[PDB]
Design a protein around this nucleic acid. Structure first.
Ligand SMILES: Nc1ccn([C@@H]2O[C@H](COP(=O)(O)OP(=O)(O)OP(=O)(O)O)[C@@H](O)[C@H]2O)c(=O)n1
Ligand SMILES: [Mg+2]
Ligand SMILES: [Zn+2]
Ligand SMILES: [Zn+2]
Lengths: 50, 73, 149, 49, 49, 1358
DNA sequence: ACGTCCCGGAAGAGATTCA
DNA sequence: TGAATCTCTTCCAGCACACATCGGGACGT
RNA sequence: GCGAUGUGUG
């Protein structure tokens, strides 16, 4: 949904935003896994485990 | 169409005399009649001046000459 | 810990995915970084910044155009811009830039009419704020004048 | 700055000889200041406001 | 703000210096459609004439 | 219409001729009605009507009545502009001193009467007395008399003996003074006296008097009697929201003065008591002083609550007077502004521009075309139509845009690329789009910058915006020759990726038949973009004129690199792309393309670069990711070694063998070294990282690590920033010039504990603070420069002279930094350069060393060229063309008119500002480099020393006892390859003239100590070393021994201030060991704060460091410490200890010793030998009683004063000094500036001169007159059979050479106005236009370009 | 209320050091 | 007896925006 | 449609 510019990072020495991106991608991965386990109704024991 | 004036500068060595000659010719076209000497492509009077200069058929000499001629007339 | 969390998800360890170009449909070389970054809007909006003036009011003491956007003002062709024009060879641009476009009253009414008739040409006169500078230096004891040609 | 007393130095700049001075200021919370300072002649001079 | 799916890469220059490039999905889902409220006044005065 | 402006004083008769009536009533208007009070300040019968041709009474309201007056209110029915033009006057009761001429410092009144300004003020404020035309009594004339003395005198002398007090008394003294004899009397007194001070005083006073007589002025005009009031319109009364008028400062001041005047008029009709009339005169005086110039007296008045209200001197002075606020920078119609954005689909000569801004800007043109086509008859129909935006105006607007340039500008405009032109292209949206190859010039990132557009109205102006200011017409910077349309970041990355090669990609080594099917393979996807490949390419060349050899062959290349060859125009040779094409490579690509094919091919080629670069960059998709930042494994080891070393230095400081500053410097240096090692480790690890298999076994290569490319290609950042991301992030600088002694030892990929982050905060706040404040400094600098280097315009095609400065390559100790090609590219050779085959004249003596000639010079290996230079150009009022050399930003020679003054001043002062506002985003890092402690020669060669005075120490080495010693490495062909600065007391390995080879350390010293090495050998006695007063005597607890520390001025009291602690080498028998060949003892003065570690009576050999001096090196080496040095240079400040130079040449001798000075008498061969000079005998002379000096040689050492450089060695000497120094600064910060600009500033510096013998001319002997003037004068005097006028040139700093100018509107506009106006007034200094800033103030053409042609016409007519 | 007032840098000029 | 050097006083300290509040009280009819 | 202060931008 948005394209930023790589060349902006190692110049503007804020390496923080790259880790923010990765960790956000982790968070949303967990989010979509829950979304699937919840769309396919999954015997809430499964939700509980995950 | 016109992007660079380099040929005009080549035929008028100053690059300031370019401004002066071109402006004078453009007033001749815009205020008092005097249709151009190059097939205008709907470019404005300014580009037409620079273009005639690139054709090497206008410069301060020719302008003085033809003004003097018509004024005697 | 981030690697471990991603790997809990079904996502690649490096955090970089292969992406396909929307236009040509063919793969990108060298996988790129995607993720979800939390982004913010800022109240510096284009429709509060854009502004344009052709002819509006004029200041009262030195007949110059007002300044600002609320007041329908024009920009400030400032001192270093005057230096830039002097550094070029441009001189007619600077003359009309600080005589006709700005100050001299006879000048700019005649310019406006010359325009609306199709005849592009200036007739300078003298900057009114300069006339004011004369009036002030003259109101002191000093006597500034303008010698005959 | 906290109302009280401060023993400042103002080293270097003045007198162009590196001879530090030593000015003690009494800064009251409401009223008139008070300053003591030496001179390059080792004289103790007071000033007020 | 709101969290959006970003991907770091050059893309036909449309992000040359810093110029973020936004897909129309964002503007369609009205996820920055902020609201302002201006206050306009109008006074009425009785003066000479 | 008019010409030169005159200025003078104003008689009361003059003022009465100005005014149109008198002001009496201190009451402005009603604000119940809004008619103005009668004959108050905004009167009607005085300052004309209030409404157009509408009298105040009402009897007359018709144009028919133009000219007539009323008869009831009596107001001339005329236009209302007359209310701007008319002026009024006050009839002050008692005269009034004019605070300007009183307190201008110099006090014109003061050094007119020659009366101390203290006493004159005491008189003017009515608290003393002064005798005026005394009489034959005990008292003088100018004598002051206090209250009590006047009391006593009137007791005794009640005679005609007259004294008064106040302005009337000052006026009486003035009026009763006759100047026409005072001038001769004071000149006689000059002829009498001899003291320099008396001379200076009397000569300033005699200048004032003779000028005051030359002008048609009278001293009794400095004292006002009739004060004029400014018109009403120029001091308008503003209505706020309501029926209330917020305070207006001029009207306030006037009201106060009028009330005082009226009350004192009332007192002087009742024979009021003397104390009250005296108090009231003083009040009126103080009121007028406030009015003219508030605040120059004591407590300024205030009106709102507590802020000084604004007086006339403040309407003129300041950052907001009419000069710097409304006569140079004006607000302009037809303008607009918005936010910028990119849009890479643009040809580089055009810029997007939103529809609404266009329709709002070109409204008049639109009206014209509408009522020309006939779609609307009147103007109001047109206004309705363009406001409603009916769908015809968009076609109209296209036709009125098509070929009409508009000027884009970015806010902090610095160099003349800050304004460019573009043709518009209408866009949707509301953001100005800007081609990407121009952000390099505007310094405009798109993080929110705003740009302003202007429209050129007149026809000449459009032609200017097209032929001088277009975007295409500027593809070379005017500072350095190198291009300024360099592709910046995404495109350089795209290229660095498109032209490279991995070892085994697809399509390895298959032959291709041309760039076309190279592209076709890459697009079909049968071969990776870069795998090396043999292709037939057909390259052209132009070996003859307009010739194009078409040679074709099978190069070895990489697929992508050929795809790039599809673009390059014909002329360029194929070896231009076969490299990897970083940023430097692509820049010089454009540079060669320009030089070889002119312009249009290069513009079209820059467009093609941008397009194809963006394309293949997108195709790469070079993303950065966390994994792509690799941590080394030498880091932990290097850090542990560094901490071991700081621990050892801590232990030694615990043992007291070293002082605090010394330990500090040791710690900081080992941290810098460890920083370097870590950076090298990481950078090697990144670069060669990728080891990949070949179809053999394995092979290494240059990596494709994303951050490595982003740092190698040269897109953004540098080794500093990638260092902070991978290695340790080094040290941190305080906001001032300090470095913390606790370096951060971690990088962003790793965490930071809280303390490390806190230190990083120290650093970053340095960054910000310095940006703001040093920005202020640099801006002020450029202002000063462009106001001394303004009135300078190329004016003649050839001066016709032969002076020329010398040019040599500059070397620092490593690679030659700026070689001869770079220095003498494009400059007219003064004197023909002989091929080193002597008498084979290689280039004639007026050629323009363009690139071909530079290659010839480089081949034939010349290391000295004498070339013409502006500083020695013999043209009147300007600089001839050739002497200025090659123009920049264009290939050909300079034109006739291009105002080099301003472009030079900008290109000097710019990178000071631009770097300032950028110095932060390196971070807080510390740009610090060690002294290297030794000179490690690099290549086989010979040795050559300059200015060595060495001595052979005990251990058989050679130490250097001379200050400026300069070492040089010569090669095996004679060429000079290396030059080093060998500091004092260093140890040479080899002597002079000995063949050394590479890696042979020749020098070795201690980088934190200036030793005091001797030259003789014997025992040591402390001379004049008393405890407690001068020295201090510490003791080592551990070794039980002691040591001396010698104190500076900061602690010694009067008990030792008159002493000099010094070592003195005796022999074994208590006698003065004399230095060989001399008669002066071997005494060695110790400077302040010096460590003496020895003992007394010790035997020591020649060359042993008797005393150490902690060196105290500065903190940091960025552009926050350089620029003040530039200010110092261009100001010409005398440094602290000016090394005295030898005035006249000849042999030397001493003289008679004073208490603490010493005579030095230099006797020439035959001439005026008695020249002497006193030398403070604590200064260690560098010449001995027997030897000989030549003018310009030194006597002591240290700094070197430009004033003396000028008056001794020569203009070429001083200019080479200034240019080398300022280039040293700007190169240490890595900034390209061609030298011509610094030389033209130097010219404008040294331009005044002083007479010595007027001869047959008309110059006062001690007069200071501008050099061009005296030159034309004595030039024509020589053209006749007379004697010239000997003169000596002075070197004023810039902020003085701009004030002491012939014009005065320039000066008035620059940096103060009170002084300039008062001086110009009392002299009646008539000013012509003659320059640029004058003509701009007054608002007409500028004798710069097009204006220069016009002024040819005008000066021809007159 | 209506109306009518109340900090580096430098250059001048003490003044102190040579005699 | 005069020429250095210490004291105090004037004058300057980057550019262009955008927006906000706020504009003097004190007494005879 | 004036000047002050203030906050914030490039
Ligand atoms: N007192 C200031 C502050 C900023 N600027 C302008 O702001 C630019 C710097 O913009 P900035 O965004 O602050 O730094 P950049 O490195 O350009 O961009 P970024 O901060 O995102 O790294 C400077 O070139 C200058 O034009 C200025 O002129 N004067
Ligand atoms: Mg920025
Ligand atoms: Zn009337
Ligand atoms: Zn010349």
């Amino acid at each position: 949904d948005i394209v930023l510019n790589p060349l902006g990072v190692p110049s503007r020495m804020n390496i923080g935003q790259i880790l923010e991106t990765h960790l956000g991608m982790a968070a949303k991965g967990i989010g979509d896994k829950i979304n699937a386990m919840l769309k396919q109704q999954q015997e809430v024991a499964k939700l509980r485990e995950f | 169409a016109r992007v660079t004036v380099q040929d005009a500068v080549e035929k008028i060595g100053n690059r300031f005399d370019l401004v002066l000659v071109a402006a004078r010719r453009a007033r001749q076209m815009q205020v008092g009649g005097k249709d151009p000497l190059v097939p205008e492509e709907n470019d404005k009077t300014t580009v037409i001046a620079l273009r005639e200069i690139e054709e090497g058929l206008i410069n301060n000499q020719i302008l003085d000459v033809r003004e003097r001629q018509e004024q005697q007339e | 810990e981030i690697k471990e969390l991603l790997k809990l998800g079904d996502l690649p360890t490096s955090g970089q995915i292969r992406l396909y170009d929307g236009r040509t449909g063919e793969q990108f070389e060298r996988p790129v970084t995607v993720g979800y970054m939390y982004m913010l809007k800022l109240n510096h909006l284009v429709d509060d910044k854009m502004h344009a003036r052709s002819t509006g009011s004029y200041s009262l003491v030195t007949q110059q155009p007002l300044g600002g956007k609320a007041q329908f003002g024009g920009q400030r062709f400032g001192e270093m811009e005057v230096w830039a024009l002097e550094a070029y060879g441009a001189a007619y641009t600077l003359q009309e830039m600080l005589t006709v476009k700005s100050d001299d009253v006879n000048g700019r009414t005649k310019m406006y009419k010359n325009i609306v008739d199709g005849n592009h040409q200036m007739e300078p006169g003298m900057p009114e704020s300069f006339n004011v500078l004369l009036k002030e230096i003259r109101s002191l004891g000093i006597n500034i004048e303008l010698e005959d040609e | 700055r906290s109302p009280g007393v401060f023993f400042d130095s103002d080293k270097g700049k003045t007198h162009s000889s590196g001879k530090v001075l030593y000015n003690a200021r009494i800064i009251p919370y409401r009223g008139s200041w008070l300053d003591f300072e030496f001179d390059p002649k080792d004289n103790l001079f007071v000033r007020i406001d | 703000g709101q969290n959006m799916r970003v991907a770091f890469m050059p893309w036909n220059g449309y992000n040359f210096e810093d110029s973020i490039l936004v897909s129309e999905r964002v503007v369609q889902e009205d996820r920055f459609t902020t609201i302002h409220i201006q206050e306009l006044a109008c006074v009425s005065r009785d003066t000479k004439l | 219409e008019f010409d030169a402006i005159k200025i003078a004083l104003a008689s009361p008769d003059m003022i009465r001729s100005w005014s149109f009536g008198e002001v009496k009533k201190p009451e402005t208007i009603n604000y119940r009605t809004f008619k103005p009070e009668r004959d108050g300040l905004f009167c009607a019968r005085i300052f004309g009507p209030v409404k157009d041709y509408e009298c105040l009474c009402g009897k007359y309201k018709r144009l028919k009545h133009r000219g007539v007056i009323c008869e009831k209110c009596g107001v001339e029915v005329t236009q209302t502009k007359v209310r701007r033009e008319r002026m009024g006057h006050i009839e002050l009761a008692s005269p009034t001193a004019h605070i300007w001429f009183l307190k201008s410092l110099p006090s014109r009144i003061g050094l007119l009467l020659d009366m101390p300004l203290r006493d004159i003020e005491r008189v003017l404020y009515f608290e003393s007395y002064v005798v005026i035309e005394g009489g034959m009594t005990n008292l003088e004339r100018q004598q002051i008399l206090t209250e009590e003395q006047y009391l006593d005198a009137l007791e005794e002398f009640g005679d005609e003996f007259d004294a008064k007090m106040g302005a009337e008394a000052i006026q009486a003294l003035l009026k009763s003074m006759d100047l026409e004899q005072e001038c001769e009397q004071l000149r006689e007194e000059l002829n009498e006296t001899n003291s320099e001070t008396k001379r200076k005083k009397l000569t300033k006073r005699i200048k004032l008097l003779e000028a005051f007589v030359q002008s048609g002025n009278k001293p009794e005009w400095m004292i006002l009697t009739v004060l004029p009031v400014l018109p009403p319109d120029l001091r308008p009364l503003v209505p706020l929201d309501g029926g209330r008028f917020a305070t207006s400062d001029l009207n306030d001041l006037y009201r106060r003065v009028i009330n005082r005047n009226n009350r004192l008029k009332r007192l002087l009709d009742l024979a009021a008591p003397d104390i009250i009339v005296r108090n009231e005169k003083r009040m009126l005086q103080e009121a007028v002083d406030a009015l003219l110039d508030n605040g120059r007296r004591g407590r300024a008045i205030t009106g709102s609550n507590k802020r000084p209200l604004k007086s006339l001197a403040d309407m003129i002075k300041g950052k907001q007077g009419r000069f710097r606020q409304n006569l140079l920078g004006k607000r302009v119609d037809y303008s607009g502004r918005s936010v910028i954005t990119v849009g890479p689909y643009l040809r580089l000569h055009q810029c997007g521009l939103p529809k609404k801004m266009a329709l709002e800007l070109f409204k008049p043109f639109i009206y014209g075309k509408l009522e020309l086509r006939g779609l609307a008859t009147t103007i109001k129909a047109a206004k309705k139509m363009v406001e409603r935006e009916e769908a015809v105006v968009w076609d109209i607007l296209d036709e009125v845009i098509r070929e009409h340039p508009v000027l884009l500008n970015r806010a902090p405009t610095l160099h003349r690329l800050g304004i460019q032109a573009f043709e518009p292209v209408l866009i949707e949206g509301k953001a100005i789009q800007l081609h990407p190859l121009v952000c390099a010039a505007y310094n405009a990132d798109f993080d929110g910058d705003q740009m302003a557009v202007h429209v050129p109205l007149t026809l000449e102006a459009q032609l200017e915006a097209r032929a001088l200011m277009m975007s295409t017409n500027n593809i070379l910077s005017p500072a350095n020759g190198e291009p300024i349309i360099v592709p910046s970041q995404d495109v350089v990355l795209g290229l660095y990726y498109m032209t490279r090669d991995c070892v085994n990609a697809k399509g390895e080594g298959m032959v291709l038949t041309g760039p076309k099917e190279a592209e076709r393979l890459y697009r079909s996807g049968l071969a990776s973009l870069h795998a090396r490949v043999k292709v037939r390419i057909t390259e052209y060349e132009k070996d003859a004129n307009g010739e194009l050899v078409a040679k074709t062959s099978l190069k070895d290349t990489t697929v992508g690199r050929a795809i790039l060859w599809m673009i390059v125009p014909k002329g360029l040779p194929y070896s231009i792309v076969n490299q990897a094409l970083g940023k430097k490579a692509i820049s010089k690509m454009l540079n060669t393309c320009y030089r070889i094919l002119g312009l249009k091919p290069t513009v079209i080629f820059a467009d093609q670069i941008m397009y194809t670069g963006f394309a293949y960059a997108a195709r790469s998709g070079a993303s950065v990711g966390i994994d792509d930042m690799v941590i080394p494994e030498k880091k932990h080891e290097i850090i542990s070694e560094a901490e071991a070393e700081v621990a050892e230095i801590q232990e030694q400081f615990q043992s007291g063998l070293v002082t605090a500053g010394e330990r500090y410097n040791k710690v900081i240096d080992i941290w810098a070294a460890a920083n370097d090692r870590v950076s090298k480790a990481m950078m090697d690890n990144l670069q060669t990282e990728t080891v990949i298999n070949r179809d053999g076994q394995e092979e290494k290569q240059v990596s494709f690590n994303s951050i490595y490319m982003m740092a190698d290609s040269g897109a953004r950042g540098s080794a500093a920033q990638i260092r902070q991301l991978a290695g340790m992030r080094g040290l941190m600088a305080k906001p001032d010039g300090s470095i913390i002694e606790t370096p951060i030892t971690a990088n962003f990929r790793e965490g930071l504990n809280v303390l490390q982050y806190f230190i990083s905060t120290h650093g970053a706040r340095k960054g910000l603070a310095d940006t703001a404040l040093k920005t202020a400094n640099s801006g002020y600098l450029t202002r000063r420069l462009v106001d001394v280097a303004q009135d300078l315009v190329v004016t003649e095609d050839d001066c016709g002279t032969h002076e020329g400065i010398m040019m040599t390559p500059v070397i620092e100790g490593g690679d030659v930094k700026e070689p001869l090609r770079d220095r003498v590219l494009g400059r007219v050779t003064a004197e023909d350069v002989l091929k080193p085959g002597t008498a084979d004249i290689l280039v004639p003596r007026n050629t323009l060393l363009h690139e071909q000639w530079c290659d010839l010079l480089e081949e034939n290996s010349v290391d000295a060229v004498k070339v013409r230079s502006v500083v020695s150009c013999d043209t009147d009022f300007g600089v001839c063309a050739h002497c200025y050399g090659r123009d920049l930003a264009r290939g050909h020679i300079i034109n006739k008119g291009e105002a080099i003054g301003v472009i030079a001043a900008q290109s000097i002062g710019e990178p000071g500002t631009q770097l300032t506002m950028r110095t932060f985003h390196i971070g807080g890092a510390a740009s610090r480099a060690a002294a290297e402690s030794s000179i490690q020669v690099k290549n086989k060669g010979s040795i050559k020393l300059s200015n060595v005075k060495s001595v052979v120490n005990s251990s058989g080495k050679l130490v250097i006892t001379s200050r400026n010693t300069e070492l040089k490495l010569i090669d095996e062909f004679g060429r000079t390859k290396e030059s080093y600065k060998v500091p004092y007391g260093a140890v040479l390995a080899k002597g002079d003239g000995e063949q050394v080879a590479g890696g042979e350390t020749v020098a070795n010293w201690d980088p934190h100590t200036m030793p005091v090495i001797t030259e003789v050998s014997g025992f040591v006695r402390f001379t004049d070393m008393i405890d407690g007063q001068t020295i201090t005597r510490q003791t080592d607890e551990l070794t039980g021994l002691s040591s001396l520390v010698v104190l500076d001025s900061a602690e010694r009291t009067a008990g030792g201030k008159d002493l000099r602690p010094a070592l003195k080498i005796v022999d074994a028998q208590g006698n003065d060991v004399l230095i060989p060949g001399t008669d002066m003892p071997a005494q060695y003065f110790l400077p302040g704060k010096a460590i003496v570690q020895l003992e007394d009576g010790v035997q020591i050999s020649s060359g042993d460091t008797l005393a150490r001096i902690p060196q105290e090196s500065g903190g940091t080496k960025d552009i926050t410490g350089g620029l003040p040095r530039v200010a110092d240079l261009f100001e010409a400040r005398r440094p602290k200890e000016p090394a005295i130079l030898a005035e006249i040449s000849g042999i030397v001798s001493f003289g008679k010793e004073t208490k603490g000075k010493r005579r030095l008498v230099i006797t020439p061969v035959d001439g005026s030998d008695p020249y002497e000079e006193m030398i403070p005998k604590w200064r260690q002379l560098n010449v001995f009683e027997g030897e000989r000096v030549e003018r310009g040689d030194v006597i002591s050492d240290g700094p070197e004063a430009p004033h003396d450089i000028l008056r001794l060695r020569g203009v070429h000497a001083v200019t080479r000094y200034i240019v080398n120094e300022v280039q040293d600064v700007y190169r240490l910060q890595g900034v390209k500036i061609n030298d011509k600009h610094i030389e033209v500033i130097v010219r404008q510096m040294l331009r005044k001169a002083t007479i010595v013998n007027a001869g047959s001319s008309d110059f006062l002997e001690g007069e200071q007159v501008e050099y061009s003037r005296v030159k034309i004068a004595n030039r024509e005097l020589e053209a006749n059979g007379k004697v010239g006028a000997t003169y000596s040139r002075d070197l004023l700093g810039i902020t003085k050479a701009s004030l002491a100018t012939e014009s005065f509107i320039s000066a008035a506009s620059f940096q103060e106005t009170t002084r300039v106006l008062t001086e110009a007034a009392v002299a009646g200094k008539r000013d012509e236009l003659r320059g640029l800033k004058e003509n701009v103030i007054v608002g007409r053409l500028i004798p710069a370009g097009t204006g220069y042609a016009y002024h040819q016409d005008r000066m021809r007519r007159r």
